[PDB]
Amino acid sequence: YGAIYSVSGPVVIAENMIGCAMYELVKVGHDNLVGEVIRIDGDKATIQVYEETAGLTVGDPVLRTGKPLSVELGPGLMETIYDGIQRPLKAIKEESQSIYIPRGIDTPALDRTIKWQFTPGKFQVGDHISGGDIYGSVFENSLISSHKILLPPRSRGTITWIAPAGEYTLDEKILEVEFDGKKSDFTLYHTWPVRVPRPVTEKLSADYPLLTGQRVLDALFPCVQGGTTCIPGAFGCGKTVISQSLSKYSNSDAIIYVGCGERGNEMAEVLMEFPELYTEMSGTKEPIMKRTTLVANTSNMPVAAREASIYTGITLAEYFRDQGKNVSMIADSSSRWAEALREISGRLGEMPADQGFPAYLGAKLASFYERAGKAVALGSPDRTGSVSIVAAVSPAGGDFSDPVTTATLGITQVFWGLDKKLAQRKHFPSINTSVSYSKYTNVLNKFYDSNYPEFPVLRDRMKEILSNAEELEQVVQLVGKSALSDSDKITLDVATLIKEDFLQQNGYSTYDAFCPIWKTFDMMRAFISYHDEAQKAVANGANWSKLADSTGDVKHAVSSSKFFEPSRGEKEVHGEFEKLLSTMQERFAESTD
Amino acid sequence: YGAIYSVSGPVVIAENMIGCAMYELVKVGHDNLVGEVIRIDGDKATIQVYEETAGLTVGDPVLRTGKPLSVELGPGLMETIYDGIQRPLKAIKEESQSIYIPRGIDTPALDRTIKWQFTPGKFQVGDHISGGDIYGSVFENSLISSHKILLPPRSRGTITWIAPAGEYTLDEKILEVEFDGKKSDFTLYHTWPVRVPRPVTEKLSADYPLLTGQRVLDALFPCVQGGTTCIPGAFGCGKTVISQSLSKYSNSDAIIYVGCGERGNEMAEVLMEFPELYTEMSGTKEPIMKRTTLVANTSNMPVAAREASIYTGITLAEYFRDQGKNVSMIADSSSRWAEALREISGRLGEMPADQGFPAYLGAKLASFYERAGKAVALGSPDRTGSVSIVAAVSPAGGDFSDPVTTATLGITQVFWGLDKKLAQRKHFPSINTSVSYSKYTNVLNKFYDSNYPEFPVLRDRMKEILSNAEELEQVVQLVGKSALSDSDKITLDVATLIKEDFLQQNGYSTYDAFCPIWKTFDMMRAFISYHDEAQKAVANGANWSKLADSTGDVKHAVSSSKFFEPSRGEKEVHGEFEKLLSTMQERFAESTD
Amino acid sequence: EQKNAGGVGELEKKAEAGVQGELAEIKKIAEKKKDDVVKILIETVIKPS
Amino acid sequence: NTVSGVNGPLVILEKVKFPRYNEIVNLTLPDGTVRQGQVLEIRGDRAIVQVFEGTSGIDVKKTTVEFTGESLRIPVSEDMLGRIFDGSGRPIDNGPKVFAEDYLDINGSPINPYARIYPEEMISTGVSAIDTMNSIARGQKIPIFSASGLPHNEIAAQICRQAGLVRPTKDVHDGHEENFSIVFAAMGVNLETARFFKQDFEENGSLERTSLFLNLANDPTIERIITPRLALTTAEYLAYQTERHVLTILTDMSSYADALREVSAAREEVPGRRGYPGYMYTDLSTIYERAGRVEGRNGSITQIPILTMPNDDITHPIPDLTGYITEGQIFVDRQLHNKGIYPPINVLPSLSRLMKSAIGEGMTRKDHGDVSNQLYAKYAIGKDAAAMKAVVGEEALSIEDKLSLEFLEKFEKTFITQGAYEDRTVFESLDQAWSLLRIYPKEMLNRISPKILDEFY
Amino acid sequence: GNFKSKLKKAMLSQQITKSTIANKMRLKVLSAREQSLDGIFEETKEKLSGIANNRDEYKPILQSLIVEALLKLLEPKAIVKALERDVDLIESMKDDIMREYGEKAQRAPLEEIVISNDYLNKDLVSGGVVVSNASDKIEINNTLEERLKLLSEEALPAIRLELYG
């Protein structure tokens, strides 16, 4: 085998390596710690061993697995919490008496002891098979089957043996494929190297909605299934909250929650919360958790876990896409991943590029977003699946001028900003028209238009009203409001109602945390209508003050609509919003008078 | 010992070092220039040679001095102007006919002309002696003795040879101590390494003030001795002026003056003025100069001497703390000092850190302020000393937000500003109440209150009056005089009288430069008594102009208290203030009616 | 204050008195099992520690 | 073998490569001294070691080495409480040593069994300005970020003395049922200041229950960087073994940064963001992984780290990473301090992420978090209204600004002004909030639900 | 009002005393525990001299100390330093040391045992060896006093818990 030449920090050099690639997985030492060969300089290969290299004896053997870092795809991933190198943390709790991995851990990369339920699909002996074809299913979703079992990509043939329904373990083979002789037998799971994407027949034009369920975010710049989203975040921005919203509210069949090296206390919270939550699809047995798979890692928990976290979590989303499931992949927070590239260049001794972050950052990020999209499923039945990436980042220079935010923004299609000034007034998630776009908006608003809303027109106006508000505010601050029309006050006044009522939606309840497409339409419609009517009112006679004073209670009636649940009225439109239109028109006549 | 391998600029590389400490002092080649071994890689050492190597050849031997870079501190330190490697500059002036040293030539650190009178302590033939225990004492000036010879730290034993009383030379030994064999011989001086601070039994929290007697200094933001203090500068816009003032009014047991790297006109000035000046305790024999020992480096003089300057001063000072002497340590300037380090860093080819200034910077600044403070000396007698470091800083790179200044304000407990306008007006120190603070105040006001003064009540009120005065003037501009009335008008007037009496000084009189604790207490007592009674009087019916004219004689007599003798009621007690209280009561009757 | 400079002596009597039971069981149980720990110390010392 | 060369306080040894990582090495120098070190690097017949004692005074071929055979692990006991230590775990009172009952790694977490049940039960510190505005839990990490020239250390003293006089009244309400202990780490802290922290512990009754670790910046860099990790091992051992909440006051975070910065210049590392290490994340993260509930879920380690802003900016890397890894921040503002407000806790950016995940019921209102949202939102508005008053003048201002102006003034001298030996209860702070918040009509109070609002304005 | 601040202050001075006394109190309990612990080690080392002065019971021990020492060296030639009463014992078992060493490593047996002309203290040090390489720059002080002193570091937690937990 190999012989350890140097152990220097978490960098290990071993000499006498053979058949080693550039992201090949190796286990180092008599301990067998997770490592990966980063580089090779001559006969000596630098491996960063990223699970605690403390007490590592030098001259131990280093063993090549013969393939790069991997994930296991197949049954037991749901309602089970893992780390980013894909070893199951839950297994570790019973034996070690520890939540997170310490070291010496040599547990297999999936739980395979357990049994899962195999149902055959629509294939029979002598029938043809091709990768991504649905060979059976295992029920493990809230309502549907989760882990639909595939022929592994890059195989085709005719199936000699189809095992019937029953329970089997992962390990047990239940399928044989013959093509050019015996290709291999197949089992319930398959493996796949994480530094390679799982194949697809073809990617498709994203054109269908992704509900976030926050009013403000969907309103200004709604997401699509297969989008890419950039969010900068400075702590205390309610990151957790929006992440929680998405896992419940989104229309995606799978949510994969990804911790890219987090607090640990924050990971516990979301974890605990999911089994209490009830699914909107009439979920069972830990409703929401049944549709949830957690990648959870801790801050100084192995740098292999952090770097790999994003690749492993997207690989899991892709398996699910190939069965024809819609997935939403919430990466939280990829700024820490960016910090992991900073470290990988320095420890290795490579030179980095702009602001001490390397340039290999940029290509490596672009490859990650491209694995996402809306898709037509791998395999011959043909279905559509999705992997939709929404990724948080943060500053690193206390600006949006830093290499990290700007590179991730370069690639992205949806941009949702960060406003420290609005955050103080108690607004979360805080965005502005000037710091956000969605290139999907045009096509998305038309889609929303069909369902009932006046959505295209209202979004144009939504932008204009906030942009005009900003310019005016600079003159009021500096010069005064007393050198400026009553009318310019009106734009600010209506704009304010939108600022509290939309933006703050962090919620103190499910009623104040959820906002369907219909409800989002309704609150916007009442505010624009108020503006149009108010400018008339003052113009034919009516002071400013009198108008402000009169509308009064009505301003409040919309303010409170968020606190009340949307299951009320006819459907998801409150009787309180329905009445609110009549009250508005009745008000303009009195204000005018 | 070693052979020069290479010379690259001012750095010298010498091979064939087979034992040499990484602080070891060395004389390189046959020029015999000063150098110290910065780093060692193999048998090749990196030595920074701090004088020019024009005439130095590869293939010349380098002979180790056999001890680290250390300084001897003995009797005769007083009335001498030194370098930071410690060479007597007056001696150079004699021989070479220049105050700057010739390179490749050095001279003994302490003068050897001098012979001093040693009288035995209290340990006699065969008595056990232990660390910091007083083995004898030596006169350090004609007038007074101050250099008590203690047993060196890190020694202990029985004294086998105790020389009898008489005058001896610095060269000649006097004592041998036996522990483990003859441990070594001892002299009237002892050596202590410059970066190693001298030790104590334990350090105390200072509660003891400086003996400056500068009235505003004492009352408003009380002087501490055993403190750390940062003062702004910009060079010769007041900062050098105050350091010269501080020296003059002070009458500490020792004062150690450090020019870290100054303009050299300023160093000349310090030397000449001091023996013409007079000590405020009424001592004789070149007065201020007799109590001052001068390490005076201009920035032109080698970089070794600049870096060693603060070090040499703190170790010397700390020893005087062990002797039971209260030391005032004046450093000018730390901005220059940070620069000595940055220079060395770029030459060697190591990376400096934040703002181009080194990595080692922050730990070095920090160690220096924390070294100074009030302690009880090492050994059974337990004499009390203090070291107060007042360091000057200016802008460095022209920004006063750069790392150097900002690092030091965080450590400091004391701040006293400098302003160009206030300096022109003859207010020194140029302070108000927000360009200055002291957090030593709390313990200090408590200390003074015990002595007899009503101090804590009166000091708080001093701060309040200045703060208010400023504030009422702004109102007069924006709001107008309609918000002004006579109660406020008295407030402005008391602050003016407080500025003139406290803040303004320049040493017009001898009684304007030493004012006791009890005198300072008495000035603030007049002005607060005037304030409260003027306000009462205008409320029972009086006007500002009427109050001003009426107070008159008393008002004049109390402003002029600084010119007046402080021995009028005894020796520290002033009679005029005691007679003010009664006058003020009869006066209040004249003002009201 | 007089009970904070002379009544703080009795508080130190009470700290002396409470440990004279400890300083004695320390020596009891150390003296008994002294011999059993030495035997483990010797086999360990003549092998790797 | 011998010392090959020495670079700053890292020493290049020529030595056989067989020793394991973190194993102690002892250099026997001809001065009589023995100095201890840790292999920072092992290489092919050579090592790079950080020396514990010293940074210099090290010979080439006359100095010799010996191996312990033992990895760097802290001997931890619970007999180390009630006694005063240096930064490397030895009494400065010079009496019996730390001793051990376990050896625990500082090079990686030992057990790492942190929180699977979110910290959610309240901890009260006797301060309204802290506890209401930022909710503290048993295992949560909220740091105090202050500026240069401020008394960061005095606010930290307040926290220590009042915490544990709350606890028996809080014990009744449910928030403790276990021993409370302080683990105090100083890096770069003044002698005077340290003596103040000991006095704080006398007042509270936990001078007997605390360990104090003193490293000065005039003690090696290598000792300084061990001091927080030594603190953590001590604090998780009490917390683990006898199920104790340990509160860790770690002052100052930049002093620790400072030392990392010097052994980066000395390493073959390039410094990343603003002259500080490109591995600055890994350092900070080692501290923050240890915090949260530890096995048995009645022991915990709760952290308040103390940061002084080296350049007085919240764009500087140190506060920015630190803030991201921790749960919130508490801000101290210079303008307050000068005015003579105490504590000078400016609540304009002060927010703590767990606010509705740090509270429950039976000791807190569920309304507690909701009330916080009014208080923070109004404070800000008020702060904006004062900014307009300064510029435009009252006459120009509209009615909304005037109310808000008024709210701001009342907030400063009553809420954030309290005594320094004065405890508060969470119920009590909310009742004080309701009166002060009562200066707006129901239209304008809308950051809390109409049910709770109708009762209390 | 201000009586309460100063009363509180003197009441804080009152528990200021209370803590220094209660700290010194446990410092006595702890330093007695060690006075006895270092009298267990006092016994151990009377035993170590008594065995060292045996020449037949001491040989299988002595051999194992040189052999173990050689595994933490792993160098082709070794110089072995001993007391002048242990040199004759090394001399009569050389073959056994090069064998036992070669058997416990992949390495082929040690070429030479050079019985050093250096001498360890006869007062302070009793038996055992300082084993060193060819150039004498790597040393394992594998003397009995040393081994007891190294065992004390790790032996101590075990003993404090069983007697005193």
UniProtKB/Swiss-Prot annotation, chains A, B:
Disulfide bonds: none annotated. Its main location: membrane. ATP binds at G233, A234, F235, G236, C237, G238, K239, T240. GO terms for molecular function: ATP binding; DNA binding; endonuclease activity; mRNA binding; proton-transporting ATPase activity, rotational mechanism. It catalyses: ATP + H2O + 4 H(+)(in) = ADP + phosphate + 5 H(+)(out). It is found in: Vacuole membrane. This protein undergoes a protein self splicing that involves a post-translational excision of the VDE intervening region (intein) followed by peptide ligation. The modification Phosphothreonine is found at T107. It comes from the Eukaryota. Keywords: Acetylation, ATP-binding, Autocatalytic cleavage, DNA-binding, Endonuclease, Hydrogen ion transport, Hydrolase, Intron homing, Ion transport, Membrane, Nuclease, Nucleotide-binding, Phosphoprotein, Protein splicing, Translocase, Transport, Vacuole. It is a peripheral membrane protein. One of its GO terms (cellular component) is Golgi membrane. Belongs to the ATPase alpha/beta chains family. Present with 199895 molecules/cell in log phase SD medium. V-ATPase is a heteromultimeric enzyme composed of a peripheral catalytic V1 complex (components A to H) attached to an integral membrane V0 proton pore complex (components: a, c, c', c'', d, e, f and VOA1). Interacts with RAV1 and RAV2 components of the RAVE complex, which are essential for the stability and assembly of V-ATPase. This is V-type proton ATPase catalytic subunit A.
From Swiss-Prot, chain C:
It comes from the Eukaryota. It is found in: Vacuole membrane. Subunit of the V1 complex of vacuolar(H+)-ATPase (V-ATPase), a multisubunit enzyme composed of a peripheral complex (V1) that hydrolyzes ATP and a membrane integral complex (V0) that translocates protons. V-ATPase is responsible for acidifying and maintaining the pH of intracellular compartments. Present with 2280 molecules/cell in log phase SD medium. V-ATPase is a heteromultimeric enzyme composed of a peripheral catalytic V1 complex (components A to H) attached to an integral membrane V0 proton pore complex (components: a, c, c', c'', d, e, f and VOA1). Belongs to the V-ATPase G subunit family. This is V-type proton ATPase subunit G. It comes from Saccharomyces cerevisiae (strain ATCC 204508 / S288c) (Baker's yeast). The gene is VMA10.
From Swiss-Prot, chain D:
Pfam families: ATP-synt_ab, ATP-synt_ab_N, ATP-synt_VA_C. It is a peripheral membrane protein. Non-catalytic subunit of the V1 complex of vacuolar(H+)-ATPase (V-ATPase), a multisubunit enzyme composed of a peripheral complex (V1) that hydrolyzes ATP and a membrane integral complex (V0) that translocates protons. V-ATPase is responsible for acidifying and maintaining the pH of intracellular compartments. GO terms for biological process: ATP metabolic process; endosomal lumen acidification; Golgi lumen acidification; intracellular calcium ion homeostasis; pexophagy; proteasome storage granule assembly; proton transmembrane transport; transmembrane transport. The modification Phosphoserine is found at S109. One of its GO terms (molecular function) is proton-transporting ATPase activity, rotational mechanism. This is V-type proton ATPase subunit B. Transmembrane segments: none annotated. It is found in: Vacuole membrane. The keyword Nucleotide-binding applies. InterPro entries: ATP-synt_VA_C, ATPase_a/bsu_AS, ATPase_F1/V1/A1_a/bsu_N, ATPase_F1/V1/A1_a/bsu_nucl-bd, ATPase_V1-cplx_bsu, P-loop_NTPase, V-ATPase_su_B/beta. V-ATPase is a heteromultimeric enzyme composed of a peripheral catalytic V1 complex (components A to H) attached to an integral membrane V0 proton pore complex (components: a, c, c', c'', d, e, f and VOA1). Interacts with RAV1 and RAV2 components of the RAVE complex, which are essential for the stability and assembly of V-ATPase. Present with 131000 molecules/cell in log phase SD medium.
Curated annotation (Swiss-Prot), chain E:
GO terms for cellular component: fungal-type vacuole membrane; Golgi membrane; membrane raft; proton-transporting V-type ATPase complex; vacuolar proton-transporting V-type ATPase complex; vacuolar proton-transporting V-type ATPase, V1 domain. It is found in: Vacuole membrane. The keyword Acetylation applies. Its main location: membrane. The keyword Coiled coil applies. Belongs to the V-ATPase E subunit family. GO terms for biological process: endosomal lumen acidification; Golgi lumen acidification; proton transmembrane transport; vacuolar acidification. It is a peripheral membrane protein. It comes from Saccharomyces cerevisiae (strain ATCC 204508 / S288c). Changing T143A: Increases ATPase activity 2.1-fold by increasing Vmax for ATP hydrolysis 2-fold. Reduces ATPase activity by 90% and produces structurally aberrant V-ATPase complexes. Homodimer. V-ATPase is a heteromultimeric enzyme composed of a peripheral catalytic V1 complex (components A to H) attached to an integral membrane V0 proton pore complex (components: a, c, c', c'', d, e, f and VOA1). Interacts with VMA5; the interaction is direct. Interacts with VMA10; the interaction is direct. Interacts with RAV1 and RAV2 components of the RAVE complex, which are essential for the stability and assembly of V-ATPase. This is V-type proton ATPase subunit E. Keywords: Acetylation, Coiled coil, Hydrogen ion transport, Ion transport, Membrane, Transport, Vacuole.
